[PDB]
Design a protein around this ligand. Structure first.
Ligand code: SF4
Lengths: 234, 84, 96, 66
RNA sequence: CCAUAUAUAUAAUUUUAAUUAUAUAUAAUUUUAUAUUAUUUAUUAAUAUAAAGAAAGGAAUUAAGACAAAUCAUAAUGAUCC
């Protein structure tokens, strides 16, 4: 539900459908302009958004994925002393010194106001064919367009698999191998969910985290078929 | 006056009350405590009660109605319903 | 062979006649060679239950000997229309 | 309860079964019931005298007789 | 079916533990008699007291729904990648 709230809030501010074929981050109208800083590396349609939260509750949207991020926070004493006993320490049907919190979040900046900035946004929207950011692209190759790691990467000997929300507007799977590059593999072997991946990879394919997304009178036919078959038996 | 009822789906008492016989042990204990309140604690005037208490609580400290069955069994017979 | 005693090695009117002769003592020969059945209505009815809709086949048939004897029969089967019609034929012969 | 028809006409229905051929063998009771018919009127019958005291039921005394 | 109690068989009683071993069978899901309580009135139940009993425990054995699980190391197939 929280992810759906952020997704909708992103959509209404941005209107992705109103600027098709516009890759990159340019401030967007809403004299008023605003741009997504984090966690999104693009301003196209969010790849994980399915409009209605209730779809997650069903038995067909149990494989759905949503954009959240995790952190660990030390438990202060008062927290440790609170979660004790049959109320808060048992299973309602070892402990830690920290809690993992899940959260969704969104950050926008509003542009400044100036004859420079206004015409700058107009010109950059007009004559800048930044190009179709294909799968595997890093966009601007800056903080503002680097892919977003949105799943815990899988780290096996000599290769690291990352699920990214890419600046191409899409949901990508990147594999970094030692044989491709020792340095980039070394960096990838320490990457974590929530980072921005700033380097290229060897294998860059379409991520299947959105698989269970696109898939989200008969009474009269039953009645007529019943009567037709019943008169056909004879 | 006689108040005849309509044909009922049943004839049942919701919470039939039963003969809860009082425990002898508790009665003896209450009498003994009353005796100690009036005639003083460890009084000899009701040592018998103490004895009796000791004799009755020694092994164990503490020493259903059938109306619905018969009502269901007999309702069709007595209800005075007219013949089919 | 190991045929159990009371078992035989490995049409509908014949089975109706045999069953009804065993159950009611009516003549099988009359049923098989002098009665004509004619289905009158053949329906799919349905009942809503907690585990979905359960469909049943309903058959109303008439049987008679064209000589002043007639009987209506109703049959109902959750599996096949053959079975509902068989039961309707049975009932019709019983209601002559 | 409705006056029943099918208890007192078992002979007629049995004879229809026998004539049609639906029943082969005549039952053992058939000739007995044929020779001893059931009562099949089931009427309410008036009474004109109290059996116990002899009082006449259903007489009106006219003004000429008073 | 274990276990428990008993019977038969087997052991040339130095492979000795015959107070044993392990095959087969039997036994109980105990039963009878009163007394007091209640009773749907006994040919019922409980409690108590007597009588006979070694008799007092345990395991397995079917489906149907719901959710979880990839050390699913309870697999197979498929997809994808090197
Ligand atoms: S980072 Fe990607 S998946 Fe997450 S909210 Fe933004 S667009 Fe959607």
């Amino acid at each position: 539900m929280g992810f759906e709230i952020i997704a909708r809030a992103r959509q209404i501010t941005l209107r992705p459908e109103n600027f098709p074929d516009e890759f990159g981050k340019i401030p967007r109208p809403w004299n008023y302009f605003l741009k997504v800083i984090a966690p999104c590396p693009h301003q196209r349609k969010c790849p994980l958004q399915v409009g209605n939260p209730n779809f997650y509750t069903h038995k067909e949207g149990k494989d759905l994925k949503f954009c959240n991020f995790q952190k660990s926070i030390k438990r202060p004493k008062f927290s440790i002393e609170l979660k004790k006993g049959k109320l808060l320490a048992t299973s309602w049907d070892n402990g830690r010194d920290y809690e993992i919190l899940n959260y969704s979040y969104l950050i926008f900046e509003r542009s400044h106001k100036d004859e420079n900035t206004l015409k700058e946004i107009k010109k950059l929207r007009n004559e800048n064919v930044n190009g179709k950011y294909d799968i595997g692209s890093l966009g601007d190759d800056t903080q503002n367009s680097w892919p977003r790691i949105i799943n815990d990467p899988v780290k096996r000997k000599g290769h690291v698999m990352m699920d990214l929300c890419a600046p191409s507007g899409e949901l990508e799977k990147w594999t970094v191998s030692r044989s491709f590059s020792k340095q980039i593999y070394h960096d990838a072997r320490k990457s974590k969910k929530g980072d921005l991946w700033a380097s290229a990879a060897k294998t860059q394919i379409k991520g299947l985290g959105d698989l269970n997304v696109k898939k989200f009178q008969l009474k009269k036919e039953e009645r007529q078929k019943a009567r037709k078959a019943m008169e056909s038996y004879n | 006056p006689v108040y005849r009822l309509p044909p009922l789906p049943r004839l049942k008492v919701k919470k039939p009350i039963i003969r809860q016989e009082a425990n002898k042990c508790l009665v003896l204990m209450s009498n003994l405590l009353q005796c100690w309140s009036s005639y003083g604690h460890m009084s000899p005037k009701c040592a018998g009660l103490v004895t009796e208490l000791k004799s009755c609580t020694s092994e164990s400290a503490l020493g259903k109605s059938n109306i619905n069955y018969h009502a269901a069994r007999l309702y069709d017979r007595i209800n005075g319903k007219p013949h089919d | 062979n190991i045929l159990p005693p009371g078992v035989s090695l490995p049409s509908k009117s014949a089975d109706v006649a045999a069953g009804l002769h065993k159950q009611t003592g009516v003549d099988p020969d009359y049923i098989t060679r002098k009665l004509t059945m004619k289905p009158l209505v053949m329906k799919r009815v349905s009942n809503q239950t907690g585990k979905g809709k359960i469909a049943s086949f309903y058959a109303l048939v008439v049987v008679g000997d064209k000589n002043g004897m007639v009987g209506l029969g109703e049959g109902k089967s959750r599996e096949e229309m053959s079975k509902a019609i068989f039961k309707a034929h049975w009932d019709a012969v019983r209601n002559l | 309860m409705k006056i029943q028809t099918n208890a007192v006409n078992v002979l007629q229905r049995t004879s229809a079964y026998l004539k049609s051929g639906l029943l082969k063998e005549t039952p053992a009771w058939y000739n007995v019931v044929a020779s001893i018919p059931p009562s099949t009127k089931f009427t309410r019958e008036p009474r004109f005298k109290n059996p116990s005291n002899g009082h006449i039921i259903g007489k009106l005394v006219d003004v000429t007789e008073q």
